[PDB]
Amino acid sequence: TDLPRLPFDNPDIMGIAPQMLALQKEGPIARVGTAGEDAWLVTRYDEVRTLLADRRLRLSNPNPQPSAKSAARAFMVALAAGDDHETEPARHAQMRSLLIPRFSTRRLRLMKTRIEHHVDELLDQLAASAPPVDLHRVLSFRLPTMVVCDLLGVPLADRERFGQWARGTFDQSDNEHSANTFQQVVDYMLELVARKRVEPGDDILSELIAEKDGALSDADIAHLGNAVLLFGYETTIVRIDLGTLLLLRNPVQRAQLAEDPGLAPAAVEEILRLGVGGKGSNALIPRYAHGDITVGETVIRTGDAVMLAIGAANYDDRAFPDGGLFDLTRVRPRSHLAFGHGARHCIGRTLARIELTAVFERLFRRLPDLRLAVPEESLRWQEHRITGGFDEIPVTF
Numbered sequence: 288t289d290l291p292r293l294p295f296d297n298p299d300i301m302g303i304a305p306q307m308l309a310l311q312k313e314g315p316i317a318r319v320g321t322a323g324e325d326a327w328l329v330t331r332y333d334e335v336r337t338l339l340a341d342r343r344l345r346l347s348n349p350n351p352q353p354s355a356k357s358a359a360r361a362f363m364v365a366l367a368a369g370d371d372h373e374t375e376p377a378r379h380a381q382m383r384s385l386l387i388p389r390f391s392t393r394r395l396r397l398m399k400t401r402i403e404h405h406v407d408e409l410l411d412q413l414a415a416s417a418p419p420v421d422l423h424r425v426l427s428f429r430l431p432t433m434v435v436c437d438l439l440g441v442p443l444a445d446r447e448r449f450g451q452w453a454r455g456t457f458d459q460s461d462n463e464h465s466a467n468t469f470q471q472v473v474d475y476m477l478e479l480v481a482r483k484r485v486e487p488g489d490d491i492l493s494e495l496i497a498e499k500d501g502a503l504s505d506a507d508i509a510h511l512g513n514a515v516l517l518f519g520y521e522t523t524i525v526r527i528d529l530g531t532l533l534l535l536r537n538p539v540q541r542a543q544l545a546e547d548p549g550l551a552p553a554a555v556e557e558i559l560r561l562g563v564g565g566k567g568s569n570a571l572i573p574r575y576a577h578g579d580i581t582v583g584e585t586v587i588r589t590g591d592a593v594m595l596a597i598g599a600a601n602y603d604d605r606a607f608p609d610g611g612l613f614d615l616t617r618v619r620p621r622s623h624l625a626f627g628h629g630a631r632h633c634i635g636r637t638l639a640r641i642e643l644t645a646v647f648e649r650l651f652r653r654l655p656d657l658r659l660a661v662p663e664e665s666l667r668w669q670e671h672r673i674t675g676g677f678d679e680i681p682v683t684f
């Protein structure tokens with residue numbers, strides 16, 4: 288008997304920690320220690336998907352004496368309207384009602400066109416440069432920040448101002464840096480709301496300002512803008528990095544994709560399913576039980592913390608045959624859980640898929656000899672950031 292303690296070691300730079308796969312083999316749910324509270328860890332696909340759809344399991348903490356959280360986690364939960372368990376039902380319902388129509392098919396069609404031309408220009412700059420080059424800086428970082436500038440209706444150079452703010456806000460190692468960074472986010476977005484009130488355009492804040500004939504306060508609108516800024520580029524950056532790394536590890540699939548860019552949608556779904564970095568602490572969706580829930584033969588009691596391991600579940604052999612293998616020829620693969628599921632299912636997931644599809648349609652056809660310029664083992668997953676990520680991806684081509 289030895290209580291497993293999150294985060295688990297991973298000897299590889301990607302994939303699932305061996306101890307978590309070991310727990311998955313024993314059963315769907317295990318009690319584990321963490322850096323803070325003990326929690327139930329749920330690792331099998333069927334159970335994680337069922338619990339994500341169970342509205343007794345919520346983001347907000349119902350306990351009278353809530354355990355302490357990093358400033359970074361507190362900001363993340365507040366941006367998702369989860370900071371007050373008594374008001375989360377109404378506030379979270381309103382948040383989704385106001386954000387979902389911002390990602391209309393009309394907007395997504397226009398953005399797909401602009402995204403595809405942008406990737407073309409990004410890859411032309413890449414192809415013309417002298418290697419070694421940092422692919423993270425010149426490609427992975429640049430497309431999703433371009434997209435957030437488009438959503439917010441600001442000049443592209445603004446991403447040079449806000450491009451490290453998700454990382455800084457979500458730095459769990461430094462509460463002062465996290466709070467100082469979030470203040471910069473807030474000031475920028477309040478500036479932006481005041482501008483869009485007199486100079487609207489075809490963008491998110493302008494639509495929120497017009498919503499319900501102006502019923503929302505500037506603070507309410509800026510809060511929604513902050514969620515889009517802070518949730519809306521960094522995780523996509525990380526998936527371009529992971530997808531590149533995964534395709535580099537699978538040359539037969541990569542050659543298939545280069546020969547037939549029509550496989551990119553399928554490749555993107557495999558990248559999202561298998562794209563887990565380092566110790567994979569970001570591939571856990573945290574929840575609290577607001578009522579008792581039975582999982583197998585285990586009772587989760589009201590107030591218990593629950594970690595839903597979407598990464599481990601996406602590797603589950605019971606849901607994906609040969610779950611550890613990258614295979615963009617899978618016939619009718621189950622829907623992966625990388626965007627979550629249920630009440631908090633990722634709001635930008637169709638836009639994120641358009642970005643990743645546009646990149647991987649193009650990348651290895653534009654740069655067929657692309658490869659790392661450094662050993663894989665030298666790439667360092669940033670465990671202190673809630674969103675993880677690599678800081679650089681040196682390549683030659």
Ligand code: HEM
Nearest residue numbers: 367514518519522523526572625626627631633634635639
């Ligand atoms: C590949 C890139 C992305 C991944 C892997 C991802 C992943 C996720 C996941 C797993 C959740 C669920 C969190 C939970 O259940 O508590 C989520 C929620 C969310 N995502 Fe995404 N996301 C991505 C891109 C985006 C983009 C591009 C946007 C917007 C521009 C966005 C906006 C949001 C928002 C606002 C939420 C909060 C949903 C809620 O709490 O109701 N995400 N995302």
Ligand SMILES: CC1(C)C[C@H]2C=C(C(=O)O)[C@@H]3COC(=O)[C@]4(CO4)[C@]23C1
Nearest residue numbers: 518522569570571572573673674675
């Ligand atoms: C709102 C989020 C940014 C989306 C989710 C994906 C993430 C990621 O890929 O890094 C974030 C990591 O931390 C979490 O709690 C998550 C798993 O819910 C995320 C919160």
